[PDB]
């Protein structure tokens, strides 16, 4: 069974604006998110530094993946009548993506066990444990999707989303149980939040394996509208979205290490006009 | 009934020229605009630190699409005659508007209300609903005017200009509530500026649907390049304009802090060669 | 009358060769003096922190202008023999600084206005009215020399240079005013610089006139070469000797204010390898 | 006997989509790791800044040097049938490589050095033998891979992966006697991560010349890719793995300075969420 | 007597592949040491900053001129058979060389006195006779080697070769004079390195009139690659090695500005993991 990869359907004019609209909006959402990552990096307490680092990392190589998907829109697909014909330049609009979440998936990974309770030399073990699952379950992915077949073959997708899948699974039972165990030994508050962040991040990574099975199941400019739509919101809302929760969070714990003389912070921790703690002096 | 989109216009020479002009003088402004945000983003206080990361937003965001835009301009219209013909990069003139606006307005939306009296998870509630009346509008209006019709046809226009203008009385009483629930709970020197901020942003707002009743009454070369004057000139006023009003408000609210002992600031803060507040230590 | 516009004219590869250094040296110093602003920031009080914003602006605005030009240049002209003929493209090796200047000389404006005495009523209503004389006036010029006439009209450009003339000696009008209003309200040494200052900044103007009548009187590749010549390094000379002029009146009375007690600075302010004030604390 | 360079290969679609994966994930993965170097740069005292540096300098380079990369594997092969085809530009796909290495191995050893007991003229005659050593290792090895034969002859390859060899066991010999010397003078802790760390860069600099031998031995598609990847995954672990070792050590030698009153450090240090030193003033 | 001028010579792909990665070596390492100078410049206290002002513009200007020229050489070669061949964009792989030598040799005259014991406005009077020397030097040298006889000529060449050389005997007079009389104000030891510097700086000035030479006196892509590698080659060792030395003087002159109580430095300076000077508070 031969599908048509999505890069391989030729647009409507208005499926080629919406398209444009989507992978401009994503970029802009995702550069605004770097310029608020820098702006606020020091609202945080060194402790949890980590969390800044992931974030700017998910933000710049995002930025960067739907940036260059957008000039290659630009150069990947020609008007030839009432339709955007598609050229040999048409999956570049969609295999950076890949690229993108292979390193950004590890750095969620990474930036939800920052603010959790794990320490040491456990902290760094089951933190390459969930990047490597993470990576993989991407990496598996974009063989189905884009390597083996040519993006073009029912069951090489098959094999490759279902092999994807386990790795999901497996990244996400080592984040669930890390969290799991973090929260009896967070305050009231931190745990909150922290469970809250966990179900959001979860989610948001079960919308991405249904742009999956539209490849395989629908093929149209309808359906490579759908896929850069799902998959635009839905880098927006989990890298706009779940990156404000694990910075509240991080605000949280410092401000809690200020108020129990763990460690001091150079300003004011405000977390929605309520001062949390006070600026202190070394 | 058809119309000519405004990218469809055939340009003389003065409207090419005049049309780079504004585009390029819009580019340069919002990029000034953008280092003065990063220069004097230590002017105010922590508590009111999304007013500067709104800002930011707003002055990348609209940078990237007007620079995007000069390029598309460049590249767009070629040189046949006395006139510049249009090619298939012209929409790449008009369309990248929608996308800064689809960030921008919600960001503007979210600066005012960074600055009022508006707390906790009644202050994040507010924040939503207008983030979401004001994405809506923007996208309600590119579908009318790029997308559904080709920008080409006069009952899109109106429908979808229509949808859009109530998004726009949602999102302006949502944030007209918001400040006159503020302004009896702020200092009068605080108040008498937010009061003229929401009218110099609301006004600013009414300008763009302008723009849109154009391109839906008029075509040719003249209401192109009084489109893009227009818009650019809104851009500059209220993207300049009300972006220092703003940070104003959250310096004067910053040095009030600081005279009440609720929070402390590391500089003195002047506005306008008169000191508000000196500067203190943890 | 018709004459040919300046980017009418082939260039012998001397003229050629001769104007990509100018806009090259030119691009390269305007980016050094945005690194030298951006490195000194610190070294003025926040009382005079507008010095720096509008001196930061004039370098970024300036940089892009001749960077654009710089490139434009490269595609602008083409060798056809010994000569560099013109294309379309040329004219965007001369109208960028139009842009330019309609920034920057509103933003040096504001830059001189930022080291005098006034507040209030004239702080902000001085500077409003010099920073429209000086738009004016550029724009105003942009008509002439670029748009309506395609630069290739006389009538245009006497019309429209005397009328960017009286934009000139409104808005000189109003900043020597004021700056002859300041000199007795600041210090013997702080005054003696500003007028000097103010001498050079209205001098360095001046210049620029010069290019808009040779492009009246004479045309060539000598004379568009003469132009290129004339305006790099007029901004050459105003954009990085005015502006470090502005700079050092800022650091005077930064250190005046540490003196008074005014203000404090974080770090000792140096002039000539002379210590003008100490380091203080909060 | 001549052999094929690796850029003289037609790529199927599965190994062109793999290599530009690989391309990118490590253009970003070095984005990512320059802004991490960015944010951790106060996490370090003043006396082992040039571990700052120097990491900062290979994460530059490098990241400019797989940009590069992408665009010329961009425009450096032309799909014609179903392999893609190299042409003049995709030498530019394999030799930036050796400009990234002439840099980063130098800059490494500086790297490693950085924290290592050695001082004054002496750690800065180490210093030069190792970065002249270093800089040789990777121009002999450029000049068989691509300079003289053009990258086609065994004689070549043979003769300056020979030379590039001698010059690879002396730099080793350089640095491992001046870490042996180190490690006496160091803390136990301290100690055990540098001798760690050393094996690790000295061990990743064994995978490079495995992608010298290939070129040597093998020629085809899957030679080509090969080697892009093992390349690519080497830059990876070694530029991102390595260079956190070296912060780590960094860190700990700022917080045992600290903790002797060597040194005060503004902020306080914090390994895997254990508190190494607090935070002090002047 | 006509030349050829440097740009006009086919390369064999040995050359080609040559002259690429030492251009594409000088632009990487003089990014790297923009990065340096901007992570180091806190080491150096305020009296002392326009060390790093200067050096930050040489790198920058530099930067920019290595990357355009490796664009340049790109666009300006062209592959016909086993040569390449130069068209119209191969003088742009020399001539900006010209426009970096304008900025940086300038930048590097002040640089040296920046460390210098000359105050006031003897200080700002050798500092202006110096940048005027080095760059008519530079701009006189660009007449013979660019522009007047297309770089063809040997009579312009030397012509303007003599002219260069008369201004370079001035500015180093000026310099060494400021030095000569600056050694017996310092400390033993700045005194000691700030003669070294003097040395190194001067002795490196002599190289690039070697390259002047060779384009006077032998042609062949031989006698271009010889051209590109010696200039490339003094760019980095002047422009990294010297720019390490001035700092070190700053560096150190700060460290005895803060043993005298002269001024405070919030950061210890150390100098090859030797603590020159303790960090202490205004
Ligand atoms: C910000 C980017 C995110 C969180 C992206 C997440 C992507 C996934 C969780 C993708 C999962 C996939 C499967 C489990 C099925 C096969 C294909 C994938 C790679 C889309
Ligand atoms: C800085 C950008 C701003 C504030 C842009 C604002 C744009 C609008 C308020 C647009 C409103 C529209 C309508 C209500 C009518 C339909 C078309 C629109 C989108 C232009
Ligand atoms: C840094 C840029 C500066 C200070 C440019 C200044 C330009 C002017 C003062 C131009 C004046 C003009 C006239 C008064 C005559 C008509 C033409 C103009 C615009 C060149
Ligand atoms: C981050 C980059 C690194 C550490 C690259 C290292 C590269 C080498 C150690 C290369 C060594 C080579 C030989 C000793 C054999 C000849 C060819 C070389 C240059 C690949
Ligand atoms: C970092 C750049 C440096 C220090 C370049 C220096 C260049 C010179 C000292 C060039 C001198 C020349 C002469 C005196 C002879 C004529 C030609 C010149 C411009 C190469
Ligand atoms: C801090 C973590 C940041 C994200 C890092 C992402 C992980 C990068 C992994 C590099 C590549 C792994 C090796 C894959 C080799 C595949 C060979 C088989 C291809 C068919
Ligand atoms: C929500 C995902 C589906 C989007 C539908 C896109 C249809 C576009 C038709 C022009
Ligand atoms: C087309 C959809 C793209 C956006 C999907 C985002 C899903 C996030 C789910 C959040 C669940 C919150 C639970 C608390
Ligand atoms: C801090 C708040 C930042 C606000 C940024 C601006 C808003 C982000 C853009 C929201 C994207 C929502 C996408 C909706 C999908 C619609 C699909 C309809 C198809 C016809
Ligand atoms: C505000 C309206 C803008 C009017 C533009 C007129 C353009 C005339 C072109 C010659
Ligand atoms: C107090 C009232 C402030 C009113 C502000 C109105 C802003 C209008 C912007 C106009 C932009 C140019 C359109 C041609
Ligand atoms: C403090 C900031 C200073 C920024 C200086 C730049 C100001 C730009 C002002 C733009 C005003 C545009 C006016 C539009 C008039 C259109 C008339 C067209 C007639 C053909
Ligand atoms: C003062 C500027 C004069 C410039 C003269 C330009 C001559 C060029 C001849 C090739
Ligand atoms: C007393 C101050 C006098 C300063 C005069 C400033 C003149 C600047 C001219 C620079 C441009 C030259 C172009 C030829
Ligand atoms: C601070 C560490 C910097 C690391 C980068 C080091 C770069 C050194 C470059 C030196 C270039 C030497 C070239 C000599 C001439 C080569 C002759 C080639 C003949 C075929
Ligand atoms: C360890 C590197 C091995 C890479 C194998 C590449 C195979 C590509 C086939 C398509
Ligand atoms: C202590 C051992 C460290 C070994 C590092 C090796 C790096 C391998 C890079 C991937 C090549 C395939
Ligand atoms: C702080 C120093 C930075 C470097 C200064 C570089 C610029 C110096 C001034 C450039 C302009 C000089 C004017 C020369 C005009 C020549 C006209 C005759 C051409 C044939
Ligand atoms: C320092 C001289 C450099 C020599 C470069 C040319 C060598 C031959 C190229 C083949
Ligand atoms: C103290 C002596 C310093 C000598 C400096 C020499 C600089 C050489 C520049 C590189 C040579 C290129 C061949």
Same mark, same amino acid.
């Given at each position: ?124 073990? +089951?933190?390459? %444990? @969930? ?6 379950? $991407? =990496?598996?992915?974009?063989?189905? &999707? !884009? ?39 967070? +305050?009231?508050? %931190? @745990? ?6 966990? $179900? =959001?991040?979860?989610?948001?990574? &079960? !919308? ?75």
């Amino acid at each position: 069974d031969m599908i048509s990869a999505p890069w391989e359907a030729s647009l409507t004019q208005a499926e080629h604006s919406l398209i444009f609209y989507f992978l401009a909006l994503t970029g802009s959402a995702l550069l605004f998110g770097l310029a608020r990552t820098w702006l606020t990096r020091g609202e945080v307490g060194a402790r949890y530094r980590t969390a800044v680092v992931a974030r700017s990392g998910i933000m710049i190589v995002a930025t960067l993946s739907y940036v260059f998907m957008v000039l290659a829109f630009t150069s990947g697909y020609d008007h030839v009548g009432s339709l955007w014909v598609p050229n040999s330049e048409a999956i570049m609009t969609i295999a950076p993506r890949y690229v993108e979440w292979s390193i950004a998936v590890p750095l969620l990974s990474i930036e939800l066990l920052s603010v959790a309770t794990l320490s040491g030399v456990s902290a760094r073990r +089951t933190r390459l %444990a @969930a990047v490597a699952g993470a990576f993989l379950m $991407i =990496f598996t992915g974009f063989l189905g &999707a !884009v390597v083996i077949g040519d993006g073009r073959s029912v069951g090489s997708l098959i094999i490759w989303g279902a092999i994807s899948t386990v790795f999901w699974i497996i990244t996400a039972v080592i984040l669930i149980r890390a969290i799991r165990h973090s929260l009896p030994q967070l +305050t009231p508050e %931190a @745990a909150a939040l922290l469970k809250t962040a966990t $179900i =959001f991040l979860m989610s948001g990574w &079960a !919308v991405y394996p249904l742009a999956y099975l539209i490849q395989i199941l629908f093929a149209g400019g309808l359906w490579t509208t759908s896929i850069h739509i799902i998959l635009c919101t839905a880098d927006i809302v989990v890298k706009l979205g779940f990156c404000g929760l694990i910075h509240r969070i991080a605000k949280l714990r410092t401000a809690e290490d200020v108020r129990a003389g763990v460690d001091i912070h150079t300003e004011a921790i405000w977390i929605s006009s309520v001062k949390q703690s006070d600026a202190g002096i070394p």
